[PDB]
Design a protein around this ligand. Structure first.
Ligand code: 24D
Ligand code: 24D
Lengths: 545, 545
């Protein structure tokens, strides 16, 4: 049981086939002139040779023209003065856009165990604007197990061989396979080989039919999550910033550089839902394992975690990567870091953005410890301070830990006030915590494996400079942030409440604002789709311009 | 003994200080109006506060205006209708360009054992166009051991503290240090602290003086090599393309993606001289460890090295990296690969380029082995064929191997014809080979270490598919390359002679051509500067447009 989708007319709706007609009307041409001239000679014909990979698209155009001279000639018509097949097809190809709901379906069947595949008759595109084809072929490609292109295999639909071929690459029986296609002709050979066939016109009936024979709802199915990340299928980067300090990250996409700075205690993976989005949106994403986390160096000394050096190391990270600047987006402790970045290295910062984390001026007259007791919900911060105590407690049950922390607003199971008195952090929580809606059991275990490397010393050391940070932070009390910034608040984040940012305007005049209702502190996994909305808008708006 | 250089007026010639005057003339302003208004209040003054990092540049402008209202007022003049300090400084900053010869000098002293450093009074730049500052600060930064900016340390020249500071960061005695600067005032405190001081105006006298007190020629010194690469200071990438196949590479720069495909038997490092250039030129460079080499998977089976799969894996490499297309530049076997890339994946190829390697149509009627005996200098290719024979011989003395192969035109020590009969490849060469001009002993040993990993099986397997490549290659006999391509020939490459490419025009109509006289087969290290010239021109010309 597996499912195969044609490109043109199935997953990519405006059909190149249909734009021909629209040109015929538009151009006052004899109905079918272009379509008939498109396939003159059958399998010996220019088009078939093209589908077989025998000639490039640019090699085909002239070959397509001549058909139209002849085809105009038999019907005894004229082809307009500036009539050009190049232009007609450019617009068309680039007029073709994904069919989000069909794609939706593939993703569901897939997620439901199905082996999926795009089986398309397609040329080798060597136009100048070919990028727009390659660009879309990537969007799609990824959400399928296979892509079979007529031009590489050397076979075209409806040659029964490409079907067997597909069958054998599928490793399935004809009876196990569903096959949707806009071209009846191409259904017949699959049909008569025994597989299911769906004729596609409206996507709605095509899907009704699909859910019917799969026994899996695809039609009007809930709002599906943004595309996530499989650590294996990723690109992983390593840069030494210091002799005993390597930073690790994940690279994806092309465009201006967007640098994602996670929080405590997370990993590059804490961005899984936005990493594909931003790439698609057209940026170059680089998700940090922040110092102390996972596959990045994790030095035991407290002082190697003050902001100054952490930023000193991001700069140096950009040094060794060929980057003048990058846009810094952070969350939790990362959102803080990003603020020092905009504050001490405007040069190197295209634009800054924080998730949850507010810009708080450092009080000259107030040792940040004093400012710790106030606001009672800041008790656990204390509990960390002492090297040893908390590390032990948090490294004791790894799985228990992340399960206990990673929870939606209401799934909470911790009261992070009275923490010190309580004698610990999970003092009054389970050891068997149930699994949140936000994470699968496999997305938890991942975090588990990252920390078996460096433990919690490092991450907890971020909380162990303050006297030092604060002091560094005072120097910048003269300054204002005048680069483009975005502040995004979460409703149900008890620790970092929207109202601490209330005063950020005194400091960042043209601060943009994003809010998110019904959202907790794990803004990335709790509200992936909205996080995406707010950040992509501001990126197009405020980054590259 | 170490050397310190100011930015403005020393390494970056048009001096911001001097453009003020040019504005005064230009604007018919009272000589010195701007300069005096630039430093009103001394150390309490806007400018000093700015140099100290107290305020951002954008915070300074208004503060700089008002000075000019007052300064115009005391001299009793008018400031023009649309008079703006913002615009005046924009142009200026972006009018400032590196001082190549001063830089030259730093690089020499450095290479000569000197500890070097930029000690500049500089602001924190938060303009929109700030990128142009960051961009240049990176060019330079890298070629020095240290950069000390007044705005981070919190100290300005000529405060004697920043000097001591510099001294203590240098870890040197005043007497050990040279210090060039355009501003006499800033020399005095260093001078009177005991270090050498040079007053810079013309760069030529400033350098005469430098070479004088260093005992090292800097003036009119030979044409220096392009900037190379220190593997440690690099960014190293890893992407799995297959279950048991990881590809490794080096990332640097930003812009369109340029993908560098080395040859046999080399490594990403075989591009050391062009990797910094292209980055600077403004592209995103990704130097491959090609399958079988160094830090990339090295599967023993022959067939995992045919072109088809090698390209299938580059595509897949671009998949997992967020790349629609990349420009492929190859050399030796890499130049070949790139040709299949342009031939089977135009979509995915922005532009193609080969170094040495020509585009040879596959003869339908001729088993490529037949076509092997012909052209006698293709004997060693035979010698490889047999899994075992050559691997053994080449893995025997690693160092001997690379020393023996990596040689300029005339440094040759091998006759790669009669190889089979001779009974080996280095049959009649030394074991103690002298070291070529092209490589230091440390650039050899590097190659040595890479191959202790995967050995020679893998690399030699590229030569072990031909019947297979050829067959794959026949399919494309219908096709023409119509994307932008560049073919670069080397004069003294006995194996890949310029004349094999003579016919490439029948295949690639608007093929661009680059030649290089007095050059061998190791085009990258033999002619780094020219390689750079040809490729950067064609990149601006033919890539991004
Ligand atoms: O405690 C954290 N992060 C960990 C954390 C936060 C919230 C929750 Cl629910 C769970 C966890 Cl583990 N921070 C406090 C200190 C940082 O700086 C800051 N700045 C201004 C106001 C408050 N904090 C923000 C991150
Ligand atoms: O032998 C090599 N490279 C290794 C090599 C070349 C030259 C020298 Cl001096 C030393 C070494 Cl080790 N090639 C021959 C096969 C490849 O394809 C090809 N295509 C057309 C004509 C000739 N070759 C080019 C690379």
């Amino acid at each position: 049981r597996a499912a195969v989708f044609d490109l043109d007319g199935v997953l990519a709706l405006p059909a190149v086939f249909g734009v021909l007609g629209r040109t015929e009307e538009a151009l006052a041409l004899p109905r079918g002139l272009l379509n008939d001239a498109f396939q003159k000679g059958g399998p010996e014909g220019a088009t078939t040779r093209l589908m077989k990979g025998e000639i490039t698209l640019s090699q085909w155009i002239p070959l397509m023209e001549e058909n139209c001279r002849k085809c105009s000639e038999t019907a005894k018509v004229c082809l307009p003065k500036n009539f050009s097949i190049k232009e007609i097809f450019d617009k068309a190809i680039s007029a073709r856009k994904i069919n989000r709901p069909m794609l939706q379906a593939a993703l569901m069947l897939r997620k439901k165990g199905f082996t999926t595949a795009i089986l398309t008759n397609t040329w080798l595109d060597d136009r100048a604007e070919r990028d727009g084809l390659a660009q879309l072929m990537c969007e799609l490609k990824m959400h399928f197990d296979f892509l079979i292109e007529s031009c590489q295999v050397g076979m075209v639909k409806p040659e029964p061989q490409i079907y067997k071929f597909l069958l054998d690459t599928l490793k399935a029986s004809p009876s196990e396979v569903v096959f949707l296609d806009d071209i009846g002709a191409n259904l017949k050979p699959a049909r008569d080989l025994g597989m299911v066939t769906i004729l596609v016109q409206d996507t709605d009936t095509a899907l009704k039919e699909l859910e019917k024979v799969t026994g899996i709802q695809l039609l009007n199915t809930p709002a599906p999550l943004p595309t996530s990340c499989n650590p294996s299928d990723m690109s992983h980067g390593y840069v030494t910033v210091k002799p005993r300090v390597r930073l690790h990250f994940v690279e994806l996409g092309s465009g201006p550089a967007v640098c994602l700075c996670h929080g405590f205690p997370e990993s590059w993976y804490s961005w899984r839902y936005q990493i594909p989005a931003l790439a698609q949106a057209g940026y170059r994403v680089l998700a940090m394992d922040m110092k102390g986390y996972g596959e990045s160096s994790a030095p035991p000394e407290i002082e190697e975690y003050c902001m100054e050096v952490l930023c000193k190391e991001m700069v140096t990270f950009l040094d060794k990567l060929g980057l003048s600047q990058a846009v810094f987006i952070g969350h939790d402790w990362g959102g803080m870091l990003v603020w020092y970045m905009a504050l001490f290295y405007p040069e190197r910062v295209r634009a800054v953005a924080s998730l949850n984390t507010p810009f708080i001026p450092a009080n000259p007259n107030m040792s940040p410890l004093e400012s710790i007791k106030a606001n009672p919900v800041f008790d656990y911060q204390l509990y960390f301070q002492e090297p040893g105590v908390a590390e032990a407690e948090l490294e004791q049950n790894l799985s228990r830990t992340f399960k206990s922390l990673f929870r939606a607003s209401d799934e909470s199971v911790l009261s992070m006030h009275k923490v010190c008195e309580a004698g610990g952090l999970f003092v009054n929580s389970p050891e068997e915590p149930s699994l949140s809606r936000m994470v699968t059991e496999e997305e938890i275990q991942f975090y588990v494996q990252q920390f078996k490397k460096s433990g919690f010393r490092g991450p907890l050391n971020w909380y162990r400079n303050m006297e030092r940070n604060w002091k560094w932070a005072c120097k910048s009390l003269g300054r204002k942030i005048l680069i483009p910034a975005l502040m995004v608040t979460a409703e149900k984040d008890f620790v970092l409440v929207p109202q601490m940012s209330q005063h950020m305007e005194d400091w960042i005049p043209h601060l943009k604002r994003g809010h998110i209702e019904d959202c907790g502190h794990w803004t990335q996994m709790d509200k992936p789709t909205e996080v995406n909305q707010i950040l992509i808008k501001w990126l197009d708006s405020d980054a590259r311009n």
